[PDB]
From Swiss-Prot, chains A, B:
Organism: Saccharomyces cerevisiae (strain ATCC 204508 / S288c)
Protein name: Bud site selection protein 6
Known role: Not essential for mitotic growth but is necessary for normal morphogenesis. Involved in the organization and/or function of the actin cytoskeleton.
Other information: Present with 2610 molecules/cell in log phase SD medium.
Coiled coil: 19-74
Length: 125, 125
């Protein structure tokens, strides 16, 4: 139901911040080398390479799966939101019919009195 | 709560079906009198002139009373509905931010890949 929904929603934000992190991290460890290679000339170990490569392969896949979650839950959410937007719609459509109806009553009950009164002026004169 | 809402709308309904049955009956009654009076000049029972004349008042009381039922619950309803679109509304802007984020990750992340790949090639040399 709707409980499931506010669950999946907080999680998305979790995965997405578990990435904004990993990525803001690589953005440094790499700007760090970039500085070291562009001026210093100190080449990083062949470890530093092999490891920051796995590091980028992780991230890269960590997106691919973040992009699953979205493409998979977006449906159900979009539908759940739709159902809800519908109930409010019909519930208000009701209060609208109802507001009209009470006018057709005020109308009809009038034309009644008007007519009941005319009869009365007939029924004595 | 939706129970609040599903019931105090069932109630409004019942209240006016009732009032509609009453107005319809009054109408039928008064019509018959009209026929007699008009077509035959056969006056209506002088008691009915008394029972009907009261019933147009119960009915006019019943309108007032119905109309009050609307005027009092309508506000709770608005508040109930608006609390609802706001929820759904937010939950959607959220979704939308996560979408625009996995965009700036895919981007931020690809520019690091582009750049690491350039360094990894300044050490190949």
């Amino acid at each position: 139901n709707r409980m499931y929904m506010e669950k999946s929603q907080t999680e998305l934000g979790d995965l997405s911040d578990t990435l904004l992190s990993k990525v803001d991290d690589l953005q440094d460890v790499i700007e760090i080398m970039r500085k070291d290679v562009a001026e210093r000339r100190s080449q990083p170990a062949k470890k530093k390479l092999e490891t920051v490569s796995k590091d980028l392969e992780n991230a890269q896949a960590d997106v691919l799966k973040l992009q699953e979650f979205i493409d998979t839950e977006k449906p159900h959410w979009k539908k759940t939101w739709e159902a809800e937007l519908d109930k409010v719609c019909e519930e208000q459509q009701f209060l609208t019919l109802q507001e009209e109806l009470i006018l057709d009553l005020k109308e009809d009950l009038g034309k009644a009195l008007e007519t009941f009164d005319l009869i009365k002026l007939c029924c004595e004169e």
